[PDB]
Write an enzyme that holds these catalytic residues in place. Structure first.
Site, PDB file in Angstrom:
ATOM      1  N   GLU A  35     -37.095  32.962 -44.288  1.00 12.56           N
ATOM      2  CA  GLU A  35     -37.478  34.181 -43.598  1.00 12.56           C
ATOM      3  C   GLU A  35     -38.081  33.865 -42.239  1.00 12.56           C
ATOM      4  O   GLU A  35     -37.816  34.540 -41.258  1.00 12.56           O
ATOM      5  CB  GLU A  35     -38.484  34.965 -44.442  1.00 12.56           C
ATOM      6  CG  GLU A  35     -37.856  35.678 -45.631  1.00 12.56           C
ATOM      7  CD  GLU A  35     -36.943  36.814 -45.222  1.00 12.56           C
ATOM      8  OE1 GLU A  35     -37.004  37.227 -44.048  1.00 12.56           O
ATOM      9  OE2 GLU A  35     -36.163  37.303 -46.061  1.00 12.56           O
ATOM     10  N   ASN A  46     -35.548  44.780 -35.857  1.00 10.96           N
ATOM     11  CA  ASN A  46     -34.399  45.310 -36.581  1.00 10.96           C
ATOM     12  C   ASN A  46     -33.728  46.426 -35.781  1.00 10.96           C
ATOM     13  O   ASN A  46     -34.315  47.022 -34.882  1.00 10.96           O
ATOM     14  CB  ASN A  46     -34.793  45.823 -37.964  1.00 10.96           C
ATOM     15  CG  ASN A  46     -35.463  44.793 -38.855  1.00 10.96           C
ATOM     16  OD1 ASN A  46     -36.660  44.847 -39.150  1.00 10.96           O
ATOM     17  ND2 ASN A  46     -34.686  43.831 -39.327  1.00 10.96           N
ATOM     18  N   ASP A  48     -33.040  49.384 -36.648  1.00  9.50           N
ATOM     19  CA  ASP A  48     -33.602  50.733 -36.765  1.00  9.50           C
ATOM     20  C   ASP A  48     -34.858  50.925 -35.936  1.00  9.50           C
ATOM     21  O   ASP A  48     -35.490  51.970 -35.975  1.00  9.50           O
ATOM     22  CB  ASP A  48     -33.893  51.049 -38.224  1.00  9.50           C
ATOM     23  CG  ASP A  48     -34.901  50.163 -38.909  1.00  9.50           C
ATOM     24  OD1 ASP A  48     -35.382  49.187 -38.317  1.00  9.50           O
ATOM     25  OD2 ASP A  48     -35.236  50.437 -40.076  1.00  9.50           O
ATOM     26  N   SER A  50     -37.498  49.123 -36.382  1.00  8.78           N
ATOM     27  CA  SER A  50     -38.581  48.435 -37.075  1.00  8.78           C
ATOM     28  C   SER A  50     -38.640  46.965 -36.654  1.00  8.78           C
ATOM     29  O   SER A  50     -37.781  46.424 -35.960  1.00  8.78           O
ATOM     30  CB  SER A  50     -38.451  48.567 -38.590  1.00  8.78           C
ATOM     31  OG  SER A  50     -37.272  47.998 -39.118  1.00  8.78           O
ATOM     32  N   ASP A  52     -39.978  42.979 -38.314  1.00  4.68           N
ATOM     33  CA  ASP A  52     -40.472  42.141 -39.390  1.00  4.68           C
ATOM     34  C   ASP A  52     -41.466  41.101 -38.846  1.00  4.68           C
ATOM     35  O   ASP A  52     -41.314  40.507 -37.783  1.00  4.68           O
ATOM     36  CB  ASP A  52     -39.361  41.405 -40.124  1.00  4.68           C
ATOM     37  CG  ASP A  52     -38.198  42.260 -40.539  1.00  4.68           C
ATOM     38  OD1 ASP A  52     -38.378  43.423 -40.910  1.00  4.68           O
ATOM     39  OD2 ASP A  52     -37.073  41.723 -40.504  1.00  4.68           O
ATOM     40  N   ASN A  59     -41.788  44.153 -43.226  1.00  5.02           N
ATOM     41  CA  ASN A  59     -41.219  45.145 -42.318  1.00  5.02           C
ATOM     42  C   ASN A  59     -42.123  46.324 -42.007  1.00  5.02           C
ATOM     43  O   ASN A  59     -42.828  46.866 -42.856  1.00  5.02           O
ATOM     44  CB  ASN A  59     -39.924  45.630 -42.968  1.00  5.02           C
ATOM     45  CG  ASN A  59     -39.275  46.750 -42.186  1.00  5.02           C
ATOM     46  OD1 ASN A  59     -39.482  47.921 -42.510  1.00  5.02           O
ATOM     47  ND2 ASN A  59     -38.522  46.347 -41.171  1.00  5.02           N
ATOM     48  N   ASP A 101     -42.977  46.639 -56.244  1.00  6.59           N
ATOM     49  CA  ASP A 101     -42.327  47.899 -55.916  1.00  6.59           C
ATOM     50  C   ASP A 101     -41.259  48.279 -56.929  1.00  6.59           C
ATOM     51  O   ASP A 101     -41.248  49.351 -57.538  1.00  6.59           O
ATOM     52  CB  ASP A 101     -41.707  47.822 -54.511  1.00  6.59           C
ATOM     53  CG  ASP A 101     -41.458  49.165 -53.857  1.00  6.59           C
ATOM     54  OD1 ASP A 101     -42.283  50.092 -54.024  1.00  6.59           O
ATOM     55  OD2 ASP A 101     -40.436  49.323 -53.141  1.00  6.59           O
TER      56      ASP A 101
END
Ligand SMILES: [Cl-]
Ligand SMILES: [Cl-]
Ligand SMILES: [Cl-]
Ligand SMILES: [Cl-]
Ligand SMILES: [Kr]
Ligand code: NA
Length: 129
Positions: A35, A46, A48, A50, A52, A59, A101
């Protein structure tokens, strides 16, 4: 801060990640490797809008506030910047909420593409733990 392999392993263990939600230590280290290359300061934007953040590339759409991800949630209740610290505590605390989650570590694309189903034990093999 750029962690060494066993160093990070040791730090993650200390912070309770070994076998957290049944994910053995070598999954976390493997996820961090791919990562962020173990770099607490890694950031990636990203498509969109966003971003990270940190060693586990958490994110901004759901987990942290960076003030520039419109309509985002802050489920870990923290500034994304906290995630870049050389103290991995905030990233670990937030990671536990993410893997709890529902889809476990599948939330980490690099983890399911590069760690999942592999011999992840190899990432800690060698380390004084
Ligand atoms: Cl392991
Ligand atoms: Cl925001
Ligand atoms: Cl730390
Ligand atoms: Cl799971
Ligand atoms: Kr972490
Ligand atoms: Na957010």
């Amino acid at each position: 801060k750029v962690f060494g392999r066993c160093e990070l392993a040791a730090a993650m263990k200390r912070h309770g990640l070994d076998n957290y939600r049944g994910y053995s230590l070598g999954n976390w280290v493997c996820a961090a490797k791919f990562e962020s290359n173990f770099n607490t300061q890694a950031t990636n934007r990203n498509t969109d809008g966003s971003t990270d953040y940190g060693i586990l590339q958490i994110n901004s759409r759901w987990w942290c506030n960076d003030g520039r991800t419109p309509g985002s949630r802050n489920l870990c209740n923290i500034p994304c910047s906290a995630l870049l610290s050389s103290d991995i505590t905030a990233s670990v605390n937030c990671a536990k909420k993410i893997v709890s989650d529902g889809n476990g570590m599948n939330a980490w694309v690099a983890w399911r593409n590069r760690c999942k189903g592999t011999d992840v034990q190899a990432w800690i093999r060698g380390c004084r733990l």
